[PDB]
Amino acid sequence: PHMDEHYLDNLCIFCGERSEEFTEEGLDLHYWKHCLMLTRCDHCKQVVEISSLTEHLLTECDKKDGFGKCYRCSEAVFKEELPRHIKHKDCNPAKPEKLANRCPLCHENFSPGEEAWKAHLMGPAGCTMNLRK
Ligand SMILES: [Zn+2]
Ligand SMILES: [Zn+2]
Ligand SMILES: [Zn+2]
Ligand SMILES: [Zn+2]
């Protein structure tokens, strides 16, 4: 069946919301301040997907050379604190990406997939560490 010619318009592809105010730059303001699926990186001040934040910090951020990956929790840690982080063994261990999503804000492992990401970050009684919520 025919896809609407303007289906990709007035839509935030990250949280799914549609709105007349979501013009091309109504969307830029949406990402910068409001979208529950995104965050501003405190280190480089860019907007990033929360579900991509660890990968951002380790491989993309302007400040990526200041982070290393904890092989226990899979999260980015400041390079200087990583030995102590590793020694303290207090982080929540990670699971295979096919088995679980991992929230970098609250450190929970949960049901994999995009629908789960949305329910965790935007749903009721979901993520307690999402500062836009
Ligand atoms: Zn959004
Ligand atoms: Zn960054
Ligand atoms: Zn760790
Ligand atoms: Zn969370």
Author numbering: 743 to 875
Text lifted from the article:
Cep104 is a key factor involved in cilia formation and length regulation that rides on the ends of elongating and shrinking cilia. It is mutated in Joubert syndrome, a genetically heterogeneous ciliopathy. Here we provide structural and biochemical data that Cep104 contains a tubulin-binding TOG (tumor overexpressed gene) domain and a novel C2HC zinc finger array. We have structurally characterized two of these domains, a central tubulin-binding TOG (tumor overexpressed gene) domain and a C-terminal domain consisting of an array of four Zn fingers (ZNF domain).
However, we obtained crystals for the human apo-Cep104 ZNF domain (S763E mutant) and solved its structure by X-ray crystallography to a resolution of 1.8 Å. The S763E mutation was used since we found it to improve the solubility of the protein. The residue S763 is located at the loop connecting the β hairpin to the α helix of the first ZNF. The Cep104 ZNF structure consists of four tandem C2HC Zn fingers that pack together to form a single globular domain that, to our knowledge, represents a novel, previously unobserved arrangement of Zn fingers. The individual Zn fingers are variants of the classical C2H2 ZNFs in which the last Zn-coordinating residue is Cys instead of His. The Zn ion is coordinated by two Cys residues located on the hairpin and by His and Cys residues from the helix with the exception of ZNF3 and ZNF4, in which the last Zn-coordinating Cys is located at a loop region downstream of the C-terminal helix cap (left). In the Cep104 domain, the sequence separation between the individual ZNFs is variable and increases from two residues between ZNF1 and ZNF2 to eight residues between ZNF3 and ZNF4. The strict conservation of these residues suggests that the compact globular shape of this domain is not due to crystal packing but that the four C2HC Cep104 ZNFs probably function as an integral, single unit. Consistent with this notion is that this domain shows a continuous patch of surface conservation that probably constitutes a protein-protein interaction interface for its binding partners.
